[PDB]
Swiss-Prot record:
Catalytic activity: Hydrolysis of proteins with specificity similar to that of pepsin A, prefers hydrophobic residues at P1 and P1', but does not cleave 14-Ala-|-Leu-15 in the B chain of insulin or Z-Glu-Tyr. Clots milk
Record keywords, A-Z: Aspartyl protease, Disulfide bond, Hydrolase, Protease, Signal, Zymogen
EC number(s) stated in the UniProt entry for this protein: 3.4.23.22
Protein name: Endothiapepsin
Positions of the Peptidase A1 domain: 17-328
Disulphide connectivity of cysteines: C255-C290
């Protein structure tokens, strides 16, 4: 089997991407944030505290003839941005782009933090990291991909995120029309539960490539590119007037700037992030200070190849017995 679904930016900055997901019988379609940095499929629901729901579409398990309470199971998750959610668990039929999993754990939120409430466009998350990170207790549950894997034509999924445009998540096949040149594959460590890999270096604009190992995670659920302070300083030093602002929470730059590109290494291959991808717009409405899309990972504890990086590539998440990651230009 295979599946193919379009993923759409939630706003004009590509802050996140939503993908329609069918849950239950008859189908209830919710728009979920596919997150290769976490491993829980959770949804706004009829159980979510009413004051914490503001415009989201909810899953109502009592209206699904295939929903079953997973008795005694609870979940609770905290994300890198400080947001969180928790609740109980149902199993139900879940379909993405024509690919169906029966008996998928659907984690129903009883509580969500303010950031989730305030984002009316995201109805929940669909985790695509390794199932070892799944938070369901006392019986850990499998991700949608893990459940689907054995049925797929090939044990892979691909992320093809758009810049200010829709893109695609495919399951079970590699669309050879969706990228240019060849795909370069690189080793993955699953020791921390992430799609963790090592970039071979970077360049800023038309500058020379610096060969240096940068361990980080491929994370579709993180907006920006978070890299070591040395690398980030070298980038922003090429933008007149750019500075790190403790009050804003990262590097800002004059909105009048033209940003240089940023290149990262994948083995001997190179992925180029155009400068425009690094512009996250005014820090507040009407400001002439703009927020940068490359930020320091210092104090996160891990480097994160988030959407800023991934949307410059066609990315293969290869879930074979020994997982790997592939990157192609597009």
């Amino acid at each position: 089997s295979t599946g193919s679904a379009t993923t759409t930016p939630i706003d004009s900055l590509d802050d996140a991407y939503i993908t329609p997901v069918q849950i239950g019988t008859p189908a209830q379609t919710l728009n979920l944030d596919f997150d290769t940095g976490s491993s829980d499929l959770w949804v706004f629901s009829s159980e979510t505290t009413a004051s914490e729901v503001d415009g989201q579409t909810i899953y109502t398990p009592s209206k699904s003839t295939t929903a079953k309470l997973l008795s005694g199971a609870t979940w609770s998750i905290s994300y890198g941005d400080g947001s969180s959610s928790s609740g109980d668990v149902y199993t139900d039929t879940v379909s993405v782009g024509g690919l169906t999993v029966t008996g998928q754990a659907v984690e129903s939120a009883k509580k969500v933090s303010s950031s989730f409430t305030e984002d009316s466009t995201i109805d929940g998350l669909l985790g695509l990291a390794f199932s070892t990170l799944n938070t369901v207790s006392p019986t850990q549950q499998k991700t949608f991909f893990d459940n689907a894997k054995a049925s797929l034509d090939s044990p892979v999924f691909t992320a093809d995120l758009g810049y200010h445009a829709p893109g695609t998540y495919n399951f079970g096949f590699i669309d050879t029309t969706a990228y240019t040149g060849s795909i370069t594959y690189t080793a993955v460590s699953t020791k921390q539960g992430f799609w963790e890999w090592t970039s071979t270096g970077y360049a800023v604009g038309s500058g020379t490539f610096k060969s240096t190992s940068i361990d980080g995670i491929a994370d579709t659920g993180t907006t920006l590119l978070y890299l070591p302070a040395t690398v980030v300083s070298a980038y922003w030093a090429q933008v007149s007037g750019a500075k790190s602002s403790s009050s804003v929470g990262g590097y800002v730059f004059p909105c009048s700037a033209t940003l240089p590109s940023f290149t990262f290494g994948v083995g001997s291959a190179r992925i180029v992030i155009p400068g425009d991808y690094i512009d996250f717009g005014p820090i507040s409405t009407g400001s002439s200070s703009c927020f940068g899309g490359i930020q320091s990972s210092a104090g996160i504890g891990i480097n994160i190849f988030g959407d800023v990086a991934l949307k410059a590539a066609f990315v293969v998440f290869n879930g074979a017995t020994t997982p790997t990651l592939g990157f192609a230009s597009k």
